[PDB]
Design a protein around this ligand. Structure first.
Ligand SMILES: OC[C@H]1O[C@@](CO)(O[C@H]2O[C@H](CO)[C@@H](O)[C@H](O)[C@H]2O)[C@@H](O)[C@@H]1O
Ligand SMILES: [Mg+2]
Length: 579
DNA sequence: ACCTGACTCT
DNA sequence: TGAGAGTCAGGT
Protein backbone atom coordinates (compact mmCIF):
# COMPACT_ATOMS: atom_id res chain seq x y z
CA UNK A 1 0.00 0.00 0.00
CA UNK A 2 2.19 2.77 -1.53
CA UNK A 3 3.00 5.83 0.56
CA UNK A 4 1.59 9.24 -0.40
CA UNK A 5 0.14 12.46 1.00
CA UNK A 6 -3.61 12.83 0.60
CA UNK A 7 -3.30 16.63 0.52
CA UNK A 8 -6.05 19.11 1.33
CA UNK A 9 -4.17 22.13 0.01
CA UNK A 10 -1.53 22.62 -2.71
CA UNK A 11 2.01 23.23 -1.37
CA UNK A 12 5.10 24.53 -3.14
CA UNK A 13 6.77 21.12 -3.10
CA UNK A 14 3.98 19.84 -5.38
CA UNK A 15 5.05 22.44 -7.98
CA UNK A 16 8.55 21.19 -8.85
CA UNK A 17 9.89 21.62 -12.30
CA UNK A 18 9.73 17.90 -13.21
CA UNK A 19 6.84 15.61 -12.26
CA UNK A 20 4.68 12.68 -13.23
CA UNK A 21 1.13 13.98 -13.44
CA UNK A 22 -2.20 12.17 -13.55
CA UNK A 23 -5.35 14.19 -14.28
CA UNK A 24 -7.95 11.48 -14.27
CA UNK A 25 -10.96 11.47 -16.56
CA UNK A 26 -12.80 8.17 -16.34
CA UNK A 27 -15.61 8.82 -18.83
CA UNK A 28 -14.64 7.27 -22.18
CA UNK A 29 -15.58 10.48 -23.99
CA UNK A 30 -13.58 13.16 -22.23
CA UNK A 31 -15.32 16.18 -23.75
CA UNK A 32 -16.70 18.40 -20.98
CA UNK A 33 -16.18 15.43 -18.64
CA UNK A 34 -15.38 15.36 -14.99
CA UNK A 35 -11.86 15.22 -13.57
CA UNK A 36 -12.15 12.80 -10.62
CA UNK A 37 -8.66 13.21 -9.11
CA UNK A 38 -5.15 14.37 -9.55
CA UNK A 39 -1.81 12.79 -8.61
CA UNK A 40 1.66 14.24 -8.67
CA UNK A 41 4.90 12.34 -8.19
CA UNK A 42 8.11 14.27 -8.07
CA UNK A 43 11.51 14.47 -6.26
CA UNK A 44 9.75 15.58 -3.05
CA UNK A 45 7.15 12.86 -2.86
CA UNK A 46 3.83 11.48 -3.94
CA UNK A 47 0.65 13.53 -3.70
CA UNK A 48 -3.09 13.12 -4.25
CA UNK A 49 -5.18 16.28 -4.79
CA UNK A 50 -8.93 16.63 -4.99
CA UNK A 51 -9.67 18.44 -8.23
CA UNK A 52 -12.11 20.96 -6.71
CA UNK A 53 -9.11 22.07 -4.61
CA UNK A 54 -6.27 21.83 -7.10
CA UNK A 55 -8.13 23.40 -10.02
CA UNK A 56 -9.35 26.37 -7.98
CA UNK A 57 -5.74 27.04 -6.77
CA UNK A 58 -4.00 29.79 -8.75
CA UNK A 59 -0.51 28.46 -8.12
CA UNK A 60 -1.50 24.91 -9.26
CA UNK A 61 -3.19 26.33 -12.38
CA UNK A 62 -0.15 28.48 -13.19
CA UNK A 63 2.10 25.40 -12.79
CA UNK A 64 -0.15 23.37 -15.13
CA UNK A 65 0.21 26.14 -17.75
CA UNK A 66 3.93 26.81 -17.38
CA UNK A 67 5.87 25.35 -20.30
CA UNK A 68 9.06 25.27 -18.23
CA UNK A 69 7.53 22.95 -15.58
CA UNK A 70 7.86 19.55 -17.20
CA UNK A 71 5.31 16.81 -16.84
CA UNK A 72 5.30 13.10 -17.76
CA UNK A 73 1.82 11.67 -18.36
CA UNK A 74 -0.18 8.88 -20.00
CA UNK A 75 -2.71 10.04 -22.63
CA UNK A 76 -2.01 13.72 -22.13
CA UNK A 77 -4.60 14.70 -24.81
CA UNK A 78 -7.42 13.37 -22.68
CA UNK A 79 -6.32 15.56 -19.71
CA UNK A 80 -5.54 18.57 -21.99
CA UNK A 81 -9.02 18.48 -23.56
CA UNK A 82 -10.85 17.94 -20.27
CA UNK A 83 -8.88 20.93 -18.86
CA UNK A 84 -9.69 23.04 -21.91
CA UNK A 85 -13.44 22.60 -21.25
CA UNK A 86 -12.72 24.05 -17.78
CA UNK A 87 -10.71 26.98 -19.19
CA UNK A 88 -7.35 25.66 -17.96
CA UNK A 89 -4.32 25.30 -20.19
CA UNK A 90 -1.96 22.29 -19.83
CA UNK A 91 1.57 22.92 -21.04
CA UNK A 92 5.03 21.45 -20.60
CA UNK A 93 4.17 17.75 -21.18
CA UNK A 94 7.57 16.42 -22.25
CA UNK A 95 6.80 12.67 -22.16
CA UNK A 96 3.59 10.82 -22.94
CA UNK A 97 3.86 7.13 -22.02
CA UNK A 98 0.86 6.15 -24.19
CA UNK A 99 2.47 7.49 -27.32
CA UNK A 100 5.86 6.05 -26.25
CA UNK A 101 4.36 2.55 -25.86
CA UNK A 102 2.43 2.85 -29.11
CA UNK A 103 5.58 3.75 -31.10
CA UNK A 104 7.54 0.89 -29.53
CA UNK A 105 4.92 -1.70 -30.58
CA UNK A 106 1.48 -0.81 -31.83
CA UNK A 107 0.47 -4.51 -31.79
CA UNK A 108 0.57 -4.67 -27.96
CA UNK A 109 -2.64 -2.78 -27.72
CA UNK A 110 -1.51 -0.56 -24.82
CA UNK A 111 -4.46 1.39 -23.58
CA UNK A 112 -3.68 1.90 -19.90
CA UNK A 113 -0.69 2.53 -17.69
CA UNK A 114 -0.63 -1.08 -16.45
CA UNK A 115 -0.32 -2.44 -19.99
CA UNK A 116 2.59 -0.08 -20.75
CA UNK A 117 4.30 -0.93 -17.48
CA UNK A 118 4.02 -4.68 -18.08
CA UNK A 119 6.23 -4.23 -21.19
CA UNK A 120 9.13 -3.46 -18.79
CA UNK A 121 8.34 -6.04 -16.08
CA UNK A 122 6.65 -3.38 -13.85
CA UNK A 123 3.51 -4.64 -12.19
CA UNK A 124 2.98 -2.37 -9.13
CA UNK A 125 -0.09 -0.75 -10.80
CA UNK A 126 -3.57 -2.14 -11.47
CA UNK A 127 -5.33 -2.11 -14.86
CA UNK A 128 -7.91 0.62 -15.04
CA UNK A 129 -10.63 -1.96 -15.86
CA UNK A 130 -9.89 -3.65 -12.51
CA UNK A 131 -10.39 -0.38 -10.58
CA UNK A 132 -13.38 1.10 -12.44
CA UNK A 133 -15.13 -2.10 -13.55
CA UNK A 134 -16.72 -2.33 -16.97
CA UNK A 135 -19.95 -1.37 -18.74
CA UNK A 136 -22.99 -1.05 -16.46
CA UNK A 137 -20.93 -1.75 -13.30
CA UNK A 138 -18.39 1.00 -14.11
CA UNK A 139 -17.99 3.42 -11.22
CA UNK A 140 -15.46 5.70 -9.55
CA UNK A 141 -14.45 3.95 -6.35
CA UNK A 142 -14.22 5.52 -2.91
CA UNK A 143 -11.46 8.04 -2.35
CA UNK A 144 -8.86 5.80 -0.67
CA UNK A 145 -8.99 3.24 -3.50
CA UNK A 146 -9.06 6.00 -6.21
CA UNK A 147 -6.18 7.94 -4.64
CA UNK A 148 -3.97 4.87 -4.37
CA UNK A 149 -4.64 3.95 -7.98
CA UNK A 150 -3.85 7.44 -9.38
CA UNK A 151 -0.69 7.59 -7.28
CA UNK A 152 0.45 4.10 -8.44
CA UNK A 153 -0.16 5.30 -12.05
CA UNK A 154 1.95 8.44 -11.46
CA UNK A 155 4.64 6.35 -9.79
CA UNK A 156 4.76 3.96 -12.80
CA UNK A 157 5.10 6.91 -15.19
CA UNK A 158 7.91 8.35 -13.09
CA UNK A 159 9.72 4.99 -13.06
CA UNK A 160 9.11 4.13 -16.73
CA UNK A 161 10.10 7.34 -18.51
CA UNK A 162 13.82 6.58 -18.63
CA UNK A 163 13.57 2.94 -19.88
CA UNK A 164 10.98 3.90 -22.54
CA UNK A 165 13.07 6.84 -23.79
CA UNK A 166 16.19 4.60 -23.82
CA UNK A 167 14.45 1.99 -26.04
CA UNK A 168 13.00 4.70 -28.31
CA UNK A 169 16.53 6.03 -28.78
CA UNK A 170 17.87 2.57 -29.63
CA UNK A 171 15.08 2.24 -32.18
CA UNK A 172 15.84 5.72 -33.64
CA UNK A 173 12.34 6.71 -32.57
CA UNK A 174 13.15 9.42 -30.00
CA UNK A 175 12.55 12.29 -32.47
CA UNK A 176 9.45 10.55 -33.72
CA UNK A 177 8.05 10.83 -30.20
CA UNK A 178 9.30 14.29 -29.18
CA UNK A 179 9.11 16.11 -32.54
CA UNK A 180 6.19 14.43 -34.27
CA UNK A 181 3.66 12.48 -32.16
CA UNK A 182 3.74 14.66 -28.98
CA UNK A 183 3.38 18.02 -30.88
CA UNK A 184 0.67 16.39 -32.93
CA UNK A 185 -1.19 15.41 -29.80
CA UNK A 186 -1.51 19.13 -28.90
CA UNK A 187 -2.85 19.88 -32.40
CA UNK A 188 -5.36 17.13 -32.24
CA UNK A 189 -6.52 18.39 -28.82
CA UNK A 190 -7.21 21.82 -30.38
CA UNK A 191 -9.12 20.23 -33.35
CA UNK A 192 -11.24 18.15 -31.10
CA UNK A 193 -12.03 21.04 -28.74
CA UNK A 194 -12.96 23.39 -31.63
CA UNK A 195 -15.29 20.82 -33.06
CA UNK A 196 -17.28 20.95 -36.33
CA UNK A 197 -20.53 22.87 -36.61
CA UNK A 198 -23.58 20.89 -37.79
CA UNK A 199 -26.72 22.27 -39.52
CA UNK A 200 -29.04 20.07 -37.56
CA UNK A 201 -32.14 21.51 -39.22
CA UNK A 202 -30.84 20.42 -42.64
CA UNK A 203 -30.07 16.94 -41.21
CA UNK A 204 -33.53 16.66 -39.72
CA UNK A 205 -35.22 17.52 -43.01
CA UNK A 206 -33.03 15.01 -44.83
CA UNK A 207 -34.12 12.45 -42.18
CA UNK A 208 -37.74 13.28 -42.92
CA UNK A 209 -37.34 12.73 -46.68
CA UNK A 210 -35.37 9.52 -46.12
CA UNK A 211 -38.00 8.16 -43.71
CA UNK A 212 -40.64 8.59 -46.45
CA UNK A 213 -38.49 6.90 -49.11
CA UNK A 214 -37.71 4.03 -46.68
CA UNK A 215 -41.43 3.49 -46.03
CA UNK A 216 -42.11 3.34 -49.81
CA UNK A 217 -39.31 0.85 -50.52
CA UNK A 218 -40.04 -1.27 -47.40
CA UNK A 219 -43.65 -1.69 -48.53
CA UNK A 220 -42.51 -2.66 -52.04
CA UNK A 221 -40.22 -5.29 -50.56
CA UNK A 222 -43.07 -6.88 -48.56
CA UNK A 223 -45.41 -6.93 -51.54
CA UNK A 224 -42.60 -8.55 -53.66
CA UNK A 225 -41.83 -11.08 -50.86
CA UNK A 226 -45.57 -11.70 -50.33
CA UNK A 227 -45.16 -11.11 -46.58
CA UNK A 228 -43.62 -8.88 -43.89
CA UNK A 229 -40.29 -9.75 -42.39
CA UNK A 230 -37.32 -8.01 -40.82
CA UNK A 231 -35.28 -6.76 -43.77
CA UNK A 232 -32.40 -5.92 -41.43
CA UNK A 233 -32.15 -9.50 -40.16
CA UNK A 234 -29.77 -11.38 -42.46
CA UNK A 235 -31.30 -14.58 -41.14
CA UNK A 236 -34.90 -13.62 -41.98
CA UNK A 237 -33.85 -12.03 -45.30
CA UNK A 238 -31.86 -15.19 -46.22
CA UNK A 239 -34.99 -17.30 -45.73
CA UNK A 240 -36.99 -15.01 -48.01
CA UNK A 241 -34.25 -14.88 -50.69
CA UNK A 242 -32.87 -18.39 -50.65
CA UNK A 243 -35.81 -20.52 -49.50
CA UNK A 244 -39.02 -18.74 -50.36
CA UNK A 245 -37.86 -17.11 -53.66
CA UNK A 246 -35.31 -19.83 -54.42
CA UNK A 247 -32.53 -17.55 -55.54
CA UNK A 248 -29.17 -19.24 -56.23
CA UNK A 249 -26.87 -19.50 -53.20
CA UNK A 250 -23.61 -18.16 -54.58
CA UNK A 251 -21.89 -17.66 -51.25
CA UNK A 252 -22.09 -18.51 -47.60
CA UNK A 253 -21.12 -16.92 -44.31
CA UNK A 254 -19.82 -18.78 -41.26
CA UNK A 255 -23.37 -18.63 -39.85
CA UNK A 256 -25.70 -18.84 -42.93
CA UNK A 257 -26.35 -17.34 -46.38
CA UNK A 258 -24.38 -14.27 -47.57
CA UNK A 259 -26.54 -11.23 -48.43
CA UNK A 260 -23.59 -8.90 -49.15
CA UNK A 261 -24.19 -6.25 -51.83
CA UNK A 262 -21.81 -7.94 -54.31
CA UNK A 263 -23.79 -11.20 -54.02
CA UNK A 264 -27.07 -9.35 -54.27
CA UNK A 265 -25.98 -7.50 -57.45
CA UNK A 266 -25.49 -10.90 -59.14
CA UNK A 267 -29.04 -12.01 -58.17
CA UNK A 268 -30.84 -8.88 -59.41
CA UNK A 269 -31.66 -10.52 -62.76
CA UNK A 270 -33.84 -13.16 -61.05
CA UNK A 271 -36.21 -11.09 -59.04
CA UNK A 272 -37.28 -7.45 -58.63
CA UNK A 273 -37.02 -7.80 -54.83
CA UNK A 274 -33.24 -7.64 -55.03
CA UNK A 275 -32.82 -4.08 -56.40
CA UNK A 276 -35.30 -2.92 -53.74
CA UNK A 277 -33.31 -4.56 -50.91
CA UNK A 278 -30.13 -2.92 -52.14
CA UNK A 279 -31.90 0.49 -52.24
CA UNK A 280 -33.38 -0.07 -48.76
CA UNK A 281 -29.95 -0.78 -47.34
CA UNK A 282 -28.43 2.28 -48.99
CA UNK A 283 -31.17 4.52 -47.51
CA UNK A 284 -31.19 2.79 -44.14
CA UNK A 285 -27.46 3.15 -43.64
CA UNK A 286 -27.75 6.87 -44.25
CA UNK A 287 -30.70 7.09 -41.85
CA UNK A 288 -29.46 5.00 -38.96
CA UNK A 289 -25.74 5.96 -39.09
CA UNK A 290 -25.38 9.37 -40.72
CA UNK A 291 -28.60 11.13 -39.76
CA UNK A 292 -29.86 9.61 -36.52
CA UNK A 293 -26.40 8.53 -35.33
CA UNK A 294 -24.87 11.93 -36.05
CA UNK A 295 -27.77 13.85 -34.47
CA UNK A 296 -27.35 11.89 -31.29
CA UNK A 297 -23.70 13.11 -30.80
CA UNK A 298 -24.24 16.81 -31.70
CA UNK A 299 -23.94 18.94 -28.54
CA UNK A 300 -27.18 20.87 -28.33
CA UNK A 301 -25.79 23.96 -26.72
CA UNK A 302 -23.42 24.76 -29.59
CA UNK A 303 -24.53 22.49 -32.38
CA UNK A 304 -21.07 21.05 -32.82
CA UNK A 305 -19.70 17.53 -32.95
CA UNK A 306 -16.46 16.99 -31.06
CA UNK A 307 -14.72 13.82 -32.32
CA UNK A 308 -11.97 12.05 -30.44
CA UNK A 309 -8.91 11.13 -32.60
CA UNK A 310 -7.30 7.94 -31.33
CA UNK A 311 -3.64 8.56 -31.99
CA UNK A 312 -2.40 5.29 -30.43
CA UNK A 313 -4.49 2.57 -32.01
CA UNK A 314 -3.83 1.69 -35.60
CA UNK A 315 -1.14 -0.60 -36.79
CA UNK A 316 0.08 1.67 -39.64
CA UNK A 317 0.25 5.11 -37.90
CA UNK A 318 -3.14 6.34 -39.07
CA UNK A 319 -5.49 8.16 -36.70
CA UNK A 320 -8.92 6.85 -35.97
CA UNK A 321 -12.02 8.95 -35.22
CA UNK A 322 -14.89 8.30 -32.87
CA UNK A 323 -18.22 9.72 -31.62
CA UNK A 324 -18.72 10.59 -34.40
CA UNK A 325 -16.33 9.01 -36.82
CA UNK A 326 -15.69 11.92 -39.19
CA UNK A 327 -13.34 9.83 -41.40
CA UNK A 328 -16.10 7.77 -43.05
CA UNK A 329 -18.74 10.35 -44.01
CA UNK A 330 -20.25 9.34 -47.36
CA UNK A 331 -18.86 10.71 -50.58
CA UNK A 332 -18.86 8.06 -53.34
CA UNK A 333 -22.62 7.99 -54.08
CA UNK A 334 -24.34 11.40 -54.60
CA UNK A 335 -27.30 10.55 -52.29
CA UNK A 336 -25.00 9.91 -49.36
CA UNK A 337 -22.57 12.71 -50.26
CA UNK A 338 -25.36 15.22 -49.51
CA UNK A 339 -24.86 14.40 -45.75
CA UNK A 340 -21.83 16.68 -46.10
CA UNK A 341 -24.07 19.71 -46.69
CA UNK A 342 -24.77 19.44 -42.94
CA UNK A 343 -21.13 20.20 -41.94
CA UNK A 344 -20.78 23.99 -42.00
CA UNK A 345 -18.37 26.69 -40.81
CA UNK A 346 -18.68 27.66 -37.15
CA UNK A 347 -18.81 31.43 -37.76
CA UNK A 348 -20.68 33.61 -40.17
CA UNK A 349 -18.85 34.59 -43.32
CA UNK A 350 -16.45 31.65 -42.92
CA UNK A 351 -15.92 28.81 -45.37
CA UNK A 352 -14.71 25.19 -45.38
CA UNK A 353 -11.38 24.53 -47.15
CA UNK A 354 -10.18 20.92 -47.92
CA UNK A 355 -6.79 19.95 -49.27
CA UNK A 356 -5.82 16.37 -50.26
CA UNK A 357 -2.68 14.62 -51.46
CA UNK A 358 -2.98 13.16 -54.94
CA UNK A 359 -1.82 9.53 -54.89
CA UNK A 360 0.45 9.94 -51.87
CA UNK A 361 0.73 6.17 -51.37
CA UNK A 362 1.89 5.35 -54.94
CA UNK A 363 4.22 8.28 -54.82
CA UNK A 364 5.77 7.00 -51.57
CA UNK A 365 6.10 3.58 -53.32
CA UNK A 366 7.90 5.21 -56.24
CA UNK A 367 10.29 6.81 -53.84
CA UNK A 368 11.00 3.76 -51.64
CA UNK A 369 11.24 1.23 -54.56
CA UNK A 370 13.09 3.67 -56.84
CA UNK A 371 11.13 2.23 -59.71
CA UNK A 372 12.22 4.14 -62.88
CA UNK A 373 8.84 3.79 -64.62
CA UNK A 374 6.74 4.74 -61.67
CA UNK A 375 9.04 7.69 -60.73
CA UNK A 376 8.87 8.93 -64.37
CA UNK A 377 5.04 8.68 -64.34
CA UNK A 378 4.77 10.91 -61.27
CA UNK A 379 7.49 13.28 -62.54
CA UNK A 380 5.17 13.81 -65.54
CA UNK A 381 2.14 14.07 -63.24
CA UNK A 382 0.41 11.41 -65.36
CA UNK A 383 -3.01 9.95 -64.59
CA UNK A 384 -1.61 6.90 -62.80
CA UNK A 385 -4.46 4.57 -63.55
CA UNK A 386 -4.43 5.31 -67.30
CA UNK A 387 -0.69 4.92 -67.36
CA UNK A 388 -0.87 1.59 -65.40
CA UNK A 389 -3.47 0.40 -67.98
CA UNK A 390 -1.16 1.38 -70.92
CA UNK A 391 1.63 -0.64 -69.38
CA UNK A 392 -0.15 -3.82 -68.22
CA UNK A 393 -2.24 -4.10 -71.42
CA UNK A 394 0.55 -2.76 -73.70
CA UNK A 395 -1.59 -0.24 -75.52
CA UNK A 396 -1.34 3.46 -76.39
CA UNK A 397 -3.21 6.04 -74.34
CA UNK A 398 -6.00 6.41 -76.89
CA UNK A 399 -6.55 2.61 -76.87
CA UNK A 400 -7.25 2.54 -73.08
CA UNK A 401 -10.90 1.76 -72.66
CA UNK A 402 -12.93 2.63 -69.54
CA UNK A 403 -12.90 -0.97 -68.39
CA UNK A 404 -9.16 -1.24 -68.83
CA UNK A 405 -8.67 1.88 -66.68
CA UNK A 406 -11.06 0.50 -64.04
CA UNK A 407 -9.13 -2.77 -63.81
CA UNK A 408 -5.79 -0.96 -63.64
CA UNK A 409 -7.18 1.29 -60.87
CA UNK A 410 -8.20 -1.87 -59.03
CA UNK A 411 -4.64 -3.26 -59.31
CA UNK A 412 -3.39 0.09 -57.93
CA UNK A 413 -5.95 -0.03 -55.06
CA UNK A 414 -4.60 -3.49 -54.32
CA UNK A 415 -1.03 -2.27 -54.17
CA UNK A 416 -2.01 0.72 -51.93
CA UNK A 417 -3.81 -1.55 -49.39
CA UNK A 418 -1.66 -4.72 -49.82
CA UNK A 419 -4.60 -7.03 -50.63
CA UNK A 420 -4.10 -10.61 -51.89
CA UNK A 421 -4.71 -12.09 -55.35
CA UNK A 422 -7.94 -13.50 -53.79
CA UNK A 423 -8.85 -9.97 -52.65
CA UNK A 424 -8.16 -8.49 -56.10
CA UNK A 425 -10.11 -11.40 -57.75
CA UNK A 426 -13.08 -10.56 -55.52
CA UNK A 427 -12.82 -6.83 -56.26
CA UNK A 428 -12.71 -7.45 -60.02
CA UNK A 429 -15.09 -10.47 -60.14
CA UNK A 430 -12.48 -12.57 -61.88
CA UNK A 431 -10.73 -15.80 -61.02
CA UNK A 432 -7.80 -15.96 -58.58
CA UNK A 433 -5.77 -17.17 -61.54
CA UNK A 434 -6.62 -14.15 -63.63
CA UNK A 435 -5.88 -11.76 -60.73
CA UNK A 436 -2.42 -13.39 -60.34
CA UNK A 437 -1.88 -12.74 -64.09
CA UNK A 438 -2.71 -9.08 -63.60
CA UNK A 439 -0.22 -8.87 -60.73
CA UNK A 440 2.47 -10.57 -62.80
CA UNK A 441 1.96 -8.13 -65.64
CA UNK A 442 2.20 -5.22 -63.17
CA UNK A 443 5.62 -6.48 -61.97
CA UNK A 444 6.90 -6.76 -65.53
CA UNK A 445 6.08 -3.06 -66.13
CA UNK A 446 7.25 -1.97 -62.66
CA UNK A 447 10.25 -4.22 -61.94
CA UNK A 448 11.57 -1.89 -59.23
CA UNK A 449 8.35 -2.42 -57.33
CA UNK A 450 8.87 -6.18 -57.64
CA UNK A 451 12.43 -5.94 -56.37
CA UNK A 452 11.22 -3.81 -53.47
CA UNK A 453 8.59 -6.32 -52.51
CA UNK A 454 11.15 -9.14 -52.57
CA UNK A 455 13.75 -7.10 -50.67
CA UNK A 456 11.35 -5.87 -47.96
CA UNK A 457 9.98 -9.35 -47.25
CA UNK A 458 13.62 -10.58 -46.76
CA UNK A 459 14.34 -7.57 -44.53
CA UNK A 460 11.22 -8.20 -42.42
CA UNK A 461 12.30 -11.83 -42.01
CA UNK A 462 15.84 -10.86 -41.01
CA UNK A 463 15.01 -7.97 -38.66
CA UNK A 464 11.63 -9.01 -37.44
CA UNK A 465 9.95 -5.78 -38.37
CA UNK A 466 9.64 -3.13 -41.05
CA UNK A 467 9.94 0.67 -40.75
CA UNK A 468 8.51 3.83 -42.31
CA UNK A 469 10.18 6.93 -43.54
CA UNK A 470 10.14 8.59 -40.12
CA UNK A 471 11.02 5.31 -38.30
CA UNK A 472 7.63 4.04 -37.25
CA UNK A 473 7.86 0.21 -36.74
CA UNK A 474 5.63 -2.77 -37.21
CA UNK A 475 6.76 -6.25 -36.00
CA UNK A 476 5.81 -9.14 -38.28
CA UNK A 477 6.41 -12.40 -36.34
CA UNK A 478 4.07 -14.26 -38.81
CA UNK A 479 6.52 -13.76 -41.66
CA UNK A 480 8.05 -17.16 -40.72
CA UNK A 481 4.72 -18.99 -40.30
CA UNK A 482 4.39 -22.43 -41.92
CA UNK A 483 0.74 -21.56 -42.77
CA UNK A 484 0.59 -20.26 -46.32
CA UNK A 485 -2.17 -17.66 -45.89
CA UNK A 486 -0.75 -16.40 -42.56
CA UNK A 487 2.73 -16.04 -43.92
CA UNK A 488 1.49 -14.45 -47.19
CA UNK A 489 -0.41 -11.77 -45.27
CA UNK A 490 2.63 -10.91 -43.21
CA UNK A 491 4.65 -10.63 -46.43
CA UNK A 492 2.01 -8.23 -47.86
CA UNK A 493 2.22 -6.20 -44.66
CA UNK A 494 5.93 -6.05 -44.95
CA UNK A 495 5.41 -4.51 -48.41
CA UNK A 496 2.45 -2.32 -47.43
CA UNK A 497 3.27 -0.87 -44.02
CA UNK A 498 6.17 1.23 -45.24
CA UNK A 499 3.79 2.69 -47.90
CA UNK A 500 0.74 3.30 -45.68
CA UNK A 501 2.83 4.22 -42.58
CA UNK A 502 5.08 6.63 -44.47
CA UNK A 503 1.98 8.36 -45.88
CA UNK A 504 0.75 8.74 -42.28
CA UNK A 505 4.13 10.11 -41.22
CA UNK A 506 4.02 12.75 -44.01
CA UNK A 507 0.56 14.05 -43.30
CA UNK A 508 1.35 14.23 -39.58
CA UNK A 509 4.43 16.28 -40.28
CA UNK A 510 2.33 18.50 -42.61
CA UNK A 511 -0.15 19.13 -39.81
CA UNK A 512 2.64 20.24 -37.48
CA UNK A 513 4.19 22.46 -40.19
CA UNK A 514 0.82 23.91 -41.09
CA UNK A 515 -0.11 24.82 -37.50
CA UNK A 516 3.22 26.65 -37.19
CA UNK A 517 2.70 28.49 -40.49
CA UNK A 518 -0.85 29.55 -39.67
CA UNK A 519 0.44 31.06 -36.41
CA UNK A 520 3.39 32.82 -38.12
CA UNK A 521 1.02 34.25 -40.74
CA UNK A 522 -1.47 35.39 -38.09
CA UNK A 523 -4.35 33.64 -39.90
CA UNK A 524 -7.60 32.82 -38.10
CA UNK A 525 -7.97 29.63 -40.16
CA UNK A 526 -8.14 26.48 -38.08
CA UNK A 527 -7.65 22.80 -38.67
CA UNK A 528 -10.80 20.79 -38.03
CA UNK A 529 -10.21 17.28 -39.35
CA UNK A 530 -7.71 14.88 -40.87
CA UNK A 531 -8.99 12.05 -43.14
CA UNK A 532 -5.84 10.00 -43.81
CA UNK A 533 -4.60 11.92 -46.82
CA UNK A 534 -6.63 15.12 -46.49
CA UNK A 535 -6.90 18.06 -44.14
CA UNK A 536 -10.11 20.07 -43.62
CA UNK A 537 -10.01 23.64 -42.24
CA UNK A 538 -12.52 26.49 -41.71
CA UNK A 539 -11.47 30.06 -42.19
CA UNK A 540 -12.85 33.55 -42.90
CA UNK A 541 -13.87 34.03 -46.53
CA UNK A 542 -11.15 36.72 -46.63
CA UNK A 543 -8.43 34.13 -46.02
CA UNK A 544 -9.32 31.66 -48.84
CA UNK A 545 -6.96 33.17 -51.42
CA UNK A 546 -4.03 32.98 -49.05
CA UNK A 547 -4.93 29.42 -47.96
CA UNK A 548 -5.06 28.28 -51.62
CA UNK A 549 -1.41 29.06 -51.81
CA UNK A 550 -0.33 28.28 -48.31
CA UNK A 551 -1.90 24.93 -47.46
CA UNK A 552 -0.82 22.98 -50.63
CA UNK A 553 2.66 24.28 -50.39
CA UNK A 554 3.06 23.31 -46.73
CA UNK A 555 1.67 19.86 -47.44
CA UNK A 556 3.79 19.36 -50.61
CA UNK A 557 6.96 20.41 -48.86
CA UNK A 558 6.50 18.39 -45.61
CA UNK A 559 9.15 15.91 -46.86
CA UNK A 560 11.34 15.73 -49.89
CA UNK A 561 10.99 12.52 -51.91
CA UNK A 562 12.53 11.42 -55.27
CA UNK A 563 9.18 12.36 -56.80
CA UNK A 564 7.06 15.49 -56.24
CA UNK A 565 4.15 15.52 -53.91
CA UNK A 566 0.96 17.10 -55.28
CA UNK A 567 -1.94 18.52 -53.32
CA UNK A 568 -5.36 19.45 -54.62
CA UNK A 569 -7.72 21.85 -52.89
CA UNK A 570 -11.29 23.19 -52.86
CA UNK A 571 -13.43 25.41 -50.70
CA UNK A 572 -17.03 26.32 -50.20
CA UNK A 573 -19.91 27.11 -47.89
CA UNK A 574 -20.28 23.53 -46.62
CA UNK A 575 -18.06 20.46 -46.62
CA UNK A 576 -20.14 19.12 -49.57
CA UNK A 577 -19.18 22.24 -51.54
CA UNK A 578 -15.49 21.91 -50.77
CA UNK A 579 -15.21 19.59 -53.82
C1' DA B 1 -22.73 -7.85 -23.26
C1' DC B 2 -20.32 -9.58 -26.79
C1' DC B 3 -20.51 -11.31 -31.58
C1' DT B 4 -21.76 -11.32 -36.52
C1' DG B 5 -22.56 -9.35 -40.80
C1' DA B 6 -23.07 -5.50 -43.63
C1' DC B 7 -21.42 -0.96 -45.10
C1' DT B 8 -18.91 3.59 -44.91
C1' DC B 9 -14.12 5.97 -45.70
C1' DT B 10 -9.03 6.32 -47.29
C1' DT C 1 -8.06 -17.13 -48.44
C1' DG C 2 -6.38 -11.21 -43.16
C1' DA C 3 -6.32 -3.41 -44.88
C1' DG C 4 -8.41 -1.77 -40.96
C1' DA C 5 -10.68 1.82 -38.80
C1' DG C 6 -16.06 2.85 -36.63
C1' DT C 7 -21.10 2.22 -36.50
C1' DC C 8 -25.39 0.00 -36.69
C1' DA C 9 -29.24 -3.68 -36.13
C1' DG C 10 -30.13 -8.22 -34.87
C1' DG C 11 -29.52 -11.99 -31.98
C1' DT C 12 -27.21 -15.27 -28.93
O1 LIG D 1 -8.31 8.87 -24.79
C1 LIG D 1 -8.08 8.19 -26.03
C2 LIG D 1 -7.09 7.09 -25.71
O2 LIG D 1 -7.70 6.32 -24.65
C3 LIG D 1 -7.79 4.96 -25.06
C4 LIG D 1 -7.57 4.10 -23.82
O3 LIG D 1 -6.21 4.39 -23.44
O4 LIG D 1 -9.05 4.78 -25.67
C5 LIG D 1 -10.16 5.07 -24.83
O5 LIG D 1 -10.83 6.28 -25.20
C6 LIG D 1 -11.27 6.36 -26.55
C7 LIG D 1 -11.93 7.74 -26.69
O6 LIG D 1 -13.32 7.73 -26.39
C8 LIG D 1 -12.16 5.16 -26.91
O7 LIG D 1 -12.41 5.07 -28.31
C9 LIG D 1 -11.49 3.85 -26.49
O8 LIG D 1 -12.42 2.77 -26.67
C10 LIG D 1 -11.09 3.91 -25.03
O9 LIG D 1 -10.43 2.69 -24.65
C11 LIG D 1 -6.72 4.74 -26.13
O10 LIG D 1 -6.93 3.55 -26.96
C12 LIG D 1 -6.78 6.11 -26.84
O11 LIG D 1 -5.55 6.48 -27.50
MG1 LIG E 1 -6.83 11.95 -52.57
Amino acid sequence: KMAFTLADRVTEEMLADKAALVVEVVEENYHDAPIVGIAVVNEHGRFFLRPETALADPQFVAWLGDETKKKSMFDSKRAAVALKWKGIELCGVSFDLLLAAYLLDPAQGVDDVAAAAKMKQYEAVRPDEAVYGKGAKRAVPDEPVLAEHLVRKAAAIWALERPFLDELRRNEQDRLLVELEQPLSSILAEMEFAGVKVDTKRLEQMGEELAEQLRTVEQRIYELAGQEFNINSPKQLGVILFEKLQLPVLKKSKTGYSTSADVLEKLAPYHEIVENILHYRQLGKLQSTYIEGLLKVVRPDTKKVHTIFNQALTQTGRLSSTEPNLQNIPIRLEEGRKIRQAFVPSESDWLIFAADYSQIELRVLAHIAEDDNLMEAFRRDLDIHTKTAMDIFQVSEDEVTPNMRRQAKAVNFGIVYGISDYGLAQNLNISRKEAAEFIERYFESFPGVKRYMENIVQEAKQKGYVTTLLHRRRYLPDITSRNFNVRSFAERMAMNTPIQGSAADIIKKAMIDLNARLKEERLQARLLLQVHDELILEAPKEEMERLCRLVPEVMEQAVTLRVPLKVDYHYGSTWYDAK
